[PDB]
Amino acid sequence: GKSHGYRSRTRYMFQRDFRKHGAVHLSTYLKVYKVGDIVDIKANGSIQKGMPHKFYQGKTGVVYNVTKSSVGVIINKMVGNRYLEKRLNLRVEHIKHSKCRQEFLERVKANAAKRAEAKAQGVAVQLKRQPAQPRESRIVSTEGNVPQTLAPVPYETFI
């Protein structure tokens, strides 16, 4: 009848890549993970041990444990009307550092520097981010930019 296996409907998900098959490059093994690191999950179809489930493919979690060849990840999974905490033991081939946290740490350092400059002078550094504001007034000239009048084109078959 019906089939719901562990790797059910993962035909394209774990498919390796185009012209990226075979042995994996060594930077993934050289990367180190500490407790509290934020990691993206993307299973390597080539390595079959410690492979995450198709649910956790594409999920971002927090490291809670570090072992010989793998790492423990905390993922909040929506079960019904709540989130449950799920602990995965995934290999570094399927684990990868998440860049959102890295960008935020860089911003934290930038705010620290701007606050130091504010303590130096006091020039209203305005740490907080702002959305894209509406454009202010501007003046557009016509030197070599005289408006070119356009008109709707008549219909043609073209075939």
């Binding site: 093994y29 010989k68 060849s69």
Partner: peptide, 17 residues
């Protein structure tokens, strides 16, 4: 030989750096 190199250069993750 990358098959041997991976096992030669891959470190225990609890031996962090």
């Amino acid at each position: 030989d990358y098959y041997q190199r991976k096992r030669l250069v891959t470190q225990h993750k609890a031996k962090y750096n």
